[PDB]
Design a protein around this ligand. Structure first.
Ligand SMILES: OC[C@H]1O[C@H](O[C@H]2[C@H](O)[C@@H](O)[C@@H](O[C@H]3[C@H](O)[C@@H](O)[C@@H](O[C@H]4[C@H](O)[C@@H](O)[C@@H](O)O[C@@H]4CO)O[C@@H]3CO)O[C@@H]2CO)[C@H](O)[C@@H](O)[C@@H]1O
Ligand SMILES: [Cl-]
Ligand SMILES: [Cl-]
Ligand SMILES: [Cl-]
Ligand SMILES: [K+]
Ligand SMILES: [K+]
Ligand SMILES: [K+]
Length: 428
């Protein structure tokens, strides 16, 4: 039953870059609330000012380690500062700084766990996340000999010089001049996981190295935040109103929310799909809201289409999640033309709010979006996307309502509690 878990993560609310902080906080809270004792080690990144607990030696120098302790029942959070762990640049500063920071975090973690073990038993498992925490995971397994579980949220696919493993005290893990840290993490782990069954398959070229000890464990979504109980009026009124607030009268509405970049989130695919459609007769019963920022080229292309058409709105400012929740709760479709997707949180947030997804058939999107709950399409293919948008527009029959309902039912089976229960089996 009850386990004591040591969870190593490189970000953790309130200190976040993208969604990882929130996902790790969610997991920890879920584990805790099932009754398990959960200790979290994570860097301070400059936000906390902890107690000195002793020195470590990193790259020929001494570093005084600091620790801030937050405790809430079975959930125990240790934020470790000292040297590079004080940089506010979570994934820095610079590439070299980052990796030195990750080594620093590895030695600092060992120090802390020794310090703690003076007064409590060893944890039953160490669960570390992403490549940044591999020095720490590998050192803890090595020194304290406890079962390790390695979870990959996103494969960085990059190598480090052996120098770093040597300096970390992990020479035995460095039999070549250059070493893939993700591969090392899978290698020393008793169990490896990633956050979706379709990403595990999309990356089987990597993950097959761990046949026999590899599985997937989905992430969750917070549907207590993402639901419609926060919105008023009916969906028609809201849409009628939003569109109008954008200069447009009613029409079936598609939304994209994403950074603007090449070969990732796929706004370029969508901007092209739109051009492809901007000559059909039905392009006129369609409204597009494009939200994000990044590549200037991609920005201009979007601003230009906005100008060319009184049918396209573009938002490069930053939207609060309260407001995004409003958008999802009022548009007809959300479009998710990713080139790859470890999990698919946006699809879930949208689905929790009755928006019907049209997504690339990549990674977790293939898991999440089943055939009664959204439309899937080849990634990278503007004509396939433009076509799907067309199908959707013809879909417009008040049995979009069947879809919407299926979307909600579905998205909500992705609870964090189920993730946690799943990780617990894996721990055991
Ligand atoms: O099981 C032992 C190790 O397993 C894992 O190692 C991985 C590496 O992380 C991968 O990067 C790769 O190793 C490559 C290596 O990256 C590359 O430099 C090259 O190595 C040559 C080397 O240049 C040359 O000097 C000579 O000694 O031969 C080497 C091998 O021919 O190619 C390597 C071979 O793939 O693959 C291994 C496979 O495991 C894990 O990362 C380690 O921590 C673990 O100890
Ligand atoms: Cl992200
Ligand atoms: Cl040390
Ligand atoms: Cl195979
Ligand atoms: K010194
Ligand atoms: K299976
Ligand atoms: K994701």
């Amino acid at each position: 039953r009850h386990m004591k878990v040591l969870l190593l993560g490189f970000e953790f609310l309130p200190v976040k870059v993208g969604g990882l902080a929130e996902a790790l906080t969610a997991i920890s809270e879920a584990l805790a609330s099932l009754g398990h004792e959960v200790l979290v080690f994570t860097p301070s990144h400059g936000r906390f000012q902890g107690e000195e607990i002793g020195k470590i030696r990193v790259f020929g120098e001494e570093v005084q380690v600091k620790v801030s302790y937050e405790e809430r029942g079975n959930l125990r959070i240790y934020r470790i500062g000292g040297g590079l762990l004080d940089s506010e640049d979570v994934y820095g500063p610079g590439w070299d700084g980052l990796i030195r920071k990750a080594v620093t975090f590895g030695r600092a973690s060992v120090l802390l766990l020794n310090d703690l073990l003076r007064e409590e038993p060893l944890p039953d498992v160490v669960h570390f996340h992403d490549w940044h925490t591999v020095f720490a995971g590998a050192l803890i397994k090595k020194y304290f000999k406890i079962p390790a579980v390695f979870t990959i949220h996103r494969l960085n696919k990059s190598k480090l010089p052996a120098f770093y493993f040597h300096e970390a005290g992990l020479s035995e893990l460095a039999p070549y001049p250059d070493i893939d840290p993700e591969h090392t993490g899978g290698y020393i782990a008793d169990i490896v996981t990633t956050v979706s069954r379709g990403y595990l398959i999309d990356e089987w070229g990597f993950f097959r190295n761990f046949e026999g000890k590899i599985t997937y464990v989905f992430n969750g979504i917070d549907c207590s935040f993402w639901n419609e109980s926060y919105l008023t009026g009916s969906r028609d009124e809201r849409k009628k109103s939003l569109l109008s607030k954008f200069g447009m009268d009613e029409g079936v509405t598609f939304m994209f929310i994403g950074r603007f970049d090449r070969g990732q989130k796929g706004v370029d695919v969508l901007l092209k799909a739109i051009e492809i459609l901007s000559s059909k007769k039905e392009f006129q019963e369609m409204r597009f809201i494009i939200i994000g920022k990044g590549d200037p080229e991609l920005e201009g292309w979007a601003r230009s289409l906005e100008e060319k058409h009184g049918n396209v709105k573009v938002i490069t400012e930053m939207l609060s999640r309260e407001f995004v929740r409003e958008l999802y709760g009022s548009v007809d479709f959300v479009i998710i033309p990713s080139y790859f997707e470890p999990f698919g949180l946006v699809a879930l947030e949208a689905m929790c709010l009755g928006a019907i997804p049209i997504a690339s058939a990549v990674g977790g999107l293939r898991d999440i979006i089943t055939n009664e709950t959204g439309i899937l399409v080849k990634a990278g293919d503007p004509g396939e996307l433009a076509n799907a948008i067309l199908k959707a527009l013809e879909l417009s029959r008040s049995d979009l309502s069947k879809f919407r309902e299926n979307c909600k039912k579905r998205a909500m089976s992705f609870s964090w509690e189920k993730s946690a229960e799943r990780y617990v089996k894996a721990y055991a």
